[PDB]
Design a protein around this motif. Structure first.
Motif, PDB file in Angstrom:
ATOM      1  N   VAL A   1      31.413 -20.086  31.605  1.00  0.00           N
ATOM      2  CA  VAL A   1      30.035 -19.731  31.917  1.00  0.00           C
ATOM      3  C   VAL A   1      29.781 -18.264  31.527  1.00  0.00           C
ATOM      4  CG1 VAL A   1      29.872 -21.505  33.795  1.00  0.00           C
ATOM      5  CG2 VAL A   1      30.361 -19.176  34.387  1.00  0.00           C
ATOM      6  N   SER A   2      28.509 -17.891  31.508  1.00  0.00           N
ATOM      7  CA  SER A   2      28.116 -16.532  31.174  1.00  0.00           C
ATOM      8  C   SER A   2      28.025 -15.572  32.358  1.00  0.00           C
ATOM      9  CB  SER A   2      26.797 -16.599  30.407  1.00  0.00           C
ATOM     10  OG  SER A   2      25.719 -16.585  31.333  1.00  0.00           O
ATOM     11  N   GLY A   3      28.368 -14.321  32.061  1.00  0.00           N
ATOM     12  CA  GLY A   3      28.327 -13.233  33.059  1.00  0.00           C
ATOM     13  C   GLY A   3      26.946 -12.686  33.301  1.00  0.00           C
ATOM     14  N   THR A   4      26.746 -11.629  34.062  1.00  0.00           N
ATOM     15  CA  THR A   4      27.731 -10.803  34.772  1.00  0.00           C
ATOM     16  C   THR A   4      28.593 -11.590  35.733  1.00  0.00           C
ATOM     17  OG1 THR A   4      27.808  -8.682  36.033  1.00  0.00           O
ATOM     18  CG2 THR A   4      25.713  -9.883  36.177  1.00  0.00           C
ATOM     19  N   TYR A   5      29.843 -11.251  35.801  1.00  0.00           N
ATOM     20  CA  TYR A   5      30.883 -11.841  36.636  1.00  0.00           C
ATOM     21  C   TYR A   5      31.082 -10.956  37.872  1.00  0.00           C
ATOM     22  CZ  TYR A   5      31.808 -14.325  32.274  1.00  0.00           C
ATOM     23  OH  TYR A   5      31.735 -14.945  31.046  1.00  0.00           O
ATOM     24  N   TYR A   6      31.470 -11.646  38.944  1.00  0.00           N
ATOM     25  CA  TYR A   6      31.734 -11.101  40.275  1.00  0.00           C
ATOM     26  C   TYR A   6      33.028 -11.773  40.757  1.00  0.00           C
ATOM     27  CZ  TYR A   6      27.007  -9.691  39.786  1.00  0.00           C
ATOM     28  OH  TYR A   6      25.777  -9.299  39.294  1.00  0.00           O
ATOM     29  N   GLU A   7      33.766 -10.952  41.450  1.00  0.00           N
ATOM     30  CA  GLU A   7      35.050 -11.427  41.990  1.00  0.00           C
ATOM     31  C   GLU A   7      34.957 -11.393  43.487  1.00  0.00           C
ATOM     32  OE1 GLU A   7      38.089  -8.471  42.404  1.00  0.00           O
ATOM     33  OE2 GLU A   7      37.561  -7.808  40.345  1.00  0.00           O
ATOM     34  N   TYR A   8      35.687 -12.298  44.123  1.00  0.00           N
ATOM     35  CA  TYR A   8      35.769 -12.449  45.594  1.00  0.00           C
ATOM     36  C   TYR A   8      37.180 -12.897  45.897  1.00  0.00           C
ATOM     37  CZ  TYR A   8      34.211 -12.959  50.447  1.00  0.00           C
ATOM     38  OH  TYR A   8      33.954 -12.664  51.773  1.00  0.00           O
ATOM     39  N   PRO A   9      37.814 -12.426  46.960  1.00  0.00           N
ATOM     40  CA  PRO A   9      39.198 -12.896  47.206  1.00  0.00           C
ATOM     41  C   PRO A   9      39.206 -14.363  47.583  1.00  0.00           C
ATOM     42  CG  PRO A   9      38.764 -10.837  48.415  1.00  0.00           C
ATOM     43  CD  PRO A   9      37.429 -11.464  47.987  1.00  0.00           C
ATOM     44  N   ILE A  10      40.178 -15.077  47.130  1.00  0.00           N
ATOM     45  CA  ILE A  10      40.399 -16.535  47.431  1.00  0.00           C
ATOM     46  C   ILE A  10      41.686 -16.404  48.267  1.00  0.00           C
ATOM     47  CG2 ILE A  10      41.285 -17.015  45.050  1.00  0.00           C
ATOM     48  CD1 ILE A  10      40.356 -20.126  45.811  1.00  0.00           C
ATOM     49  N   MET A  11      41.801 -16.972  49.448  1.00  0.00           N
ATOM     50  CA  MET A  11      43.065 -16.762  50.244  1.00  0.00           C
ATOM     51  C   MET A  11      44.117 -17.873  50.251  1.00  0.00           C
ATOM     52  SD  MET A  11      41.792 -13.872  50.755  1.00  0.00           S
ATOM     53  CE  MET A  11      42.938 -12.840  51.610  1.00  0.00           C
ATOM     54  N   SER A  12      45.349 -17.395  50.205  1.00  0.00           N
ATOM     55  CA  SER A  12      46.603 -18.126  50.185  1.00  0.00           C
ATOM     56  C   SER A  12      46.818 -19.114  51.342  1.00  0.00           C
ATOM     57  CB  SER A  12      47.740 -17.112  50.424  1.00  0.00           C
ATOM     58  OG  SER A  12      48.535 -17.288  49.283  1.00  0.00           O
TER      59      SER A  12
ATOM     60  N   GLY B   1      44.712  -9.701  49.302  1.00  0.00           N
ATOM     61  CA  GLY B   1      45.747 -10.489  48.592  1.00  0.00           C
ATOM     62  C   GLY B   1      45.570 -10.248  47.092  1.00  0.00           C
ATOM     63  N   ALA B   2      46.159 -11.178  46.354  1.00  0.00           N
ATOM     64  CA  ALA B   2      46.126 -11.046  44.892  1.00  0.00           C
ATOM     65  C   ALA B   2      45.242 -11.977  44.097  1.00  0.00           C
ATOM     66  CB  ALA B   2      47.589 -11.328  44.437  1.00  0.00           C
ATOM     67  N   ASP B   3      44.671 -12.928  44.777  1.00  0.00           N
ATOM     68  CA  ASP B   3      43.858 -13.906  44.033  1.00  0.00           C
ATOM     69  C   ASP B   3      42.378 -13.709  44.247  1.00  0.00           C
ATOM     70  OD1 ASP B   3      46.701 -14.968  43.634  1.00  0.00           O
ATOM     71  OD2 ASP B   3      46.180 -16.419  45.184  1.00  0.00           O
ATOM     72  N   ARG B   4      41.736 -14.029  43.099  1.00  0.00           N
ATOM     73  CA  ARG B   4      40.276 -13.889  43.039  1.00  0.00           C
ATOM     74  C   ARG B   4      39.526 -15.008  42.361  1.00  0.00           C
ATOM     75  NH1 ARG B   4      42.390 -10.398  45.336  1.00  0.00           N
ATOM     76  NH2 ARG B   4      42.122  -8.132  45.076  1.00  0.00           N
ATOM     77  N   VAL B   5      38.441 -15.381  43.011  1.00  0.00           N
ATOM     78  CA  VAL B   5      37.665 -16.420  42.335  1.00  0.00           C
ATOM     79  C   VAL B   5      36.595 -15.570  41.596  1.00  0.00           C
ATOM     80  CG1 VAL B   5      36.113 -16.901  44.346  1.00  0.00           C
ATOM     81  CG2 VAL B   5      36.377 -18.588  42.511  1.00  0.00           C
ATOM     82  N   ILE B   6      36.198 -16.044  40.439  1.00  0.00           N
ATOM     83  CA  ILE B   6      35.165 -15.449  39.554  1.00  0.00           C
ATOM     84  C   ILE B   6      33.944 -16.357  39.447  1.00  0.00           C
ATOM     85  CG2 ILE B   6      34.653 -14.184  37.375  1.00  0.00           C
ATOM     86  CD1 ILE B   6      37.114 -12.960  39.277  1.00  0.00           C
ATOM     87  N   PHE B   7      32.753 -15.753  39.673  1.00  0.00           N
ATOM     88  CA  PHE B   7      31.531 -16.519  39.631  1.00  0.00           C
ATOM     89  C   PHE B   7      30.398 -15.653  39.081  1.00  0.00           C
ATOM     90  CE2 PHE B   7      29.164 -14.566  43.245  1.00  0.00           C
ATOM     91  CZ  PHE B   7      30.261 -13.957  43.897  1.00  0.00           C
ATOM     92  N   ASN B   8      29.329 -16.250  38.727  1.00  0.00           N
ATOM     93  CA  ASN B   8      28.167 -15.466  38.171  1.00  0.00           C
ATOM     94  C   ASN B   8      27.016 -15.563  39.187  1.00  0.00           C
ATOM     95  OD1 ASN B   8      26.750 -17.948  37.664  1.00  0.00           O
ATOM     96  ND2 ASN B   8      27.466 -18.048  35.551  1.00  0.00           N
ATOM     97  N   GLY B   9      25.940 -14.838  38.891  1.00  0.00           N
ATOM     98  CA  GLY B   9      24.725 -14.722  39.663  1.00  0.00           C
ATOM     99  C   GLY B   9      23.981 -16.017  39.859  1.00  0.00           C
ATOM    100  N   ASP B  10      24.391 -17.086  39.214  1.00  0.00           N
ATOM    101  CA  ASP B  10      23.804 -18.453  39.328  1.00  0.00           C
ATOM    102  C   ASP B  10      24.655 -19.404  40.188  1.00  0.00           C
ATOM    103  OD1 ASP B  10      21.449 -18.220  37.707  1.00  0.00           O
ATOM    104  OD2 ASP B  10      22.977 -17.583  36.199  1.00  0.00           O
TER     105      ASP B  10
END
Ligand SMILES: Nc1nc2c(ncn2[C@@H]2O[C@H](CO)[C@@H](OP(=O)(O)O)[C@H]2O)c(=O)[nH]1
Length: 105
Positions: A51-62, A73-82
């Motif tokens: 998908v197209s950006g701008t991209y945003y990261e948020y922690p995803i938990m273990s 933690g170390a993991d991140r989910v990536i999503f856009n403004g949509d």
């Protein structure tokens, strides 16, 4: 209940991912942050995102709980403004402060 994404040794189910993206997006939409997340993800790394950006990261938990503050933690989910899913990334197995993609397809 397959591993949508696998972060290092951590197995994330589709339902884990959608809950983390949903949480980060409700904040994003409300113009809010909790301990600095979500925040713009630059894609310095050069990843593919369906998908197209701008991209945003948020922690995803273990542990499978949604992030609500504290250590990310170390993991991140990536999503856009949509509210579209771009992917899951991790610091695990990445050098210093880089990111590597989580296995999937
Ligand atoms: N590696 C990487 N880091 C980024 C990018 N965009 C912002 N950052 C920032 O630098 C640090 C990410 O390595 C991130 O903290 P994080 O651990 O919350 O992601 C974040 O604040 C990017 O595209 N790639």
């Amino acid at each position: 209940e397959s591993c949508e994404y696998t972060c290092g040794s951590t197995c994330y189910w589709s339902s884990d991912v959608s809950a983390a993206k949903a949480k980060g997006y409700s904040l994003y939409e409300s113009g809010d942050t909790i301990d600095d997340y979500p925040h713009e993800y630059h894609d310095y790394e050069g990843f593919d995102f369906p998908v197209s950006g701008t991209y945003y990261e948020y922690p995803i938990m273990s542990d499978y709980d949604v992030y609500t503050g504290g250590s990310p933690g170390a993991d991140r989910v990536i999503f856009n403004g949509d509210d579209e899913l771009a992917g899951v990334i991790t610091h695990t197995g990445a050098s210093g402060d880089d990111f590597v993609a989580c296995s999937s397809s």
